[PDB]
Each structure stands twice: as structure tokens, then as C-alpha cells.
Swiss-Prot record:
Keyword vocabulary terms for this entry: Dioxygenase, Iron, Metal-binding, Oxidoreductase
Organism per entry: Bacillus subtilis (strain 168)
GO MF assignments: cysteine dioxygenase activity; ferrous iron binding; oxidoreductase activity, acting on single donors with incorporation of molecular oxygen, incorporation of two atoms of oxygen
UniProt-listed Enzyme Commission number(s): 1.13.11.20
Protein name (database record): Cysteine dioxygenase
Broadest EC class assigned to this enzyme: oxidoreductase
pH dependence of function: Optimum pH is 6.2.
Length: 156
């Protein structure tokens, strides 16, 4: 069995029923050199400041490939009601946590996650992903359930 990406996704993410942020984190880590399999699903920034490519979906979860060019960031957001886990494939990102504070949001914590490492995005959590490095950052995300309505905040 010489696995291709979608082949791995079905084999790992397809039978999940109500998975936890750690169920998702260990399943992402179960992908064989996910970095190579991920290409060529990586895309250049179209509508967003970052490349975003939805590549899998069911009633349970949703998988997207994200590409944050050097010195680019996402918005400050929550994932509606579906959690997310991501794994930086190649690159290094700064994940900033935000504190709920009205209609705007204040920075609460911040840290880096490197290739092969994941970021957990529990329910209600508000964050921002940026790329301070001079190289691009490619990430493999999983949301459960699929994102329905994220709310973008206007920070402190
Ligand atoms: Fe996010």
C-alpha cells in the first residue's frame, strides 16, 4: 500500500466521530512525511493574505492547506464552534492567543510552533497566526466540525 495523501486522510480522518483536539493532533502526526504529500495542494494567496486550500470534508471534519508568505498573518478569530489543530508542515509560525474583551480583543499569550509540531485550537479560543520568518509557512489544518461562522475581532 503506497499511500497518496487523500488515501491517508480517508484511512486516518474518515472514521472519526466527535474527535477531541488531541484526537486530531495525534491523527495529523500519523501522516507519513505529510510535507511532501501536502504539495501540490499548497496554493498562493488569492482572496486572503495567505494561501488557503480546502481539500477534504465530511460531516465530522474539514481539512485545509494553509500557506502564510513571509511577514503575513491571518485575522484574529475563533472557529465558530468547531475546534482546530494544525500542523506546520514546513515553516515556523507565531500563534498569538487573544483574550475576549468586548468587541475588540487583547493579546493574551503567544508562542511558536515549528515543523512537525501542532497548535491546538479549543472551542471558543481566539487566535492569530503570523509568520515573522523570511521563508513561507505551510500548515495542515483540521476543523471539527467544519467551520461555519468564524468571528473576526478588531484587536486592542
Ligand atoms: Fe484558526
Amino acid at each position: 500500500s503506497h499511500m497518496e495523501l487523500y488515501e491517508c486522510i480517508q484511512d486516518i480522518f474518515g472514521g472519526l466521530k466527535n474527535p477531541s483536539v488531541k484526537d486530531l493532533a495525534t491523527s495529523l502526526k500519523q501522516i507519513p512525511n505529510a510535507a511532501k504529500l501536502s504539495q501540490p495542494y499548497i496554493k498562493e494567496p488569492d482572496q486572503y493574505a495567505y494561501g488557503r486550500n480546502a481539500i477534504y470534508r465530511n460531516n465530522e471534519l474539514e481539512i485545509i492547506v494553509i500557506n502564510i508568505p513571509p511577514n503575513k498573518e491571518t485575522t484574529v478569530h475563533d472557529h465558530g464552534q468547531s475546534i482546530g489543530c494544525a500542523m506546520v508542515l514546513e515553516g515556523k509560525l507565531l500563534n498569538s492567543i487573544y483574550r475576549s474583551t468586548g468587541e475588540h480583543a487583547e493579546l493574551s499569550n503567544s508562542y511558536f510552533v515549528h515543523e512537525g509540531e501542532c497548535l491546538i485550537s479549543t472551542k471558543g479560543l481566539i487566535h492569530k497566526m503570523s509568520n515573522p520568518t523570511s521563508e513561507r509557512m505551510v500548515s495542515l489544518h483540521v476543523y471539527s466540525p467544519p467551520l461555519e461562522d468564524m468571528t473576526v475581532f478588531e484587536e486592542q
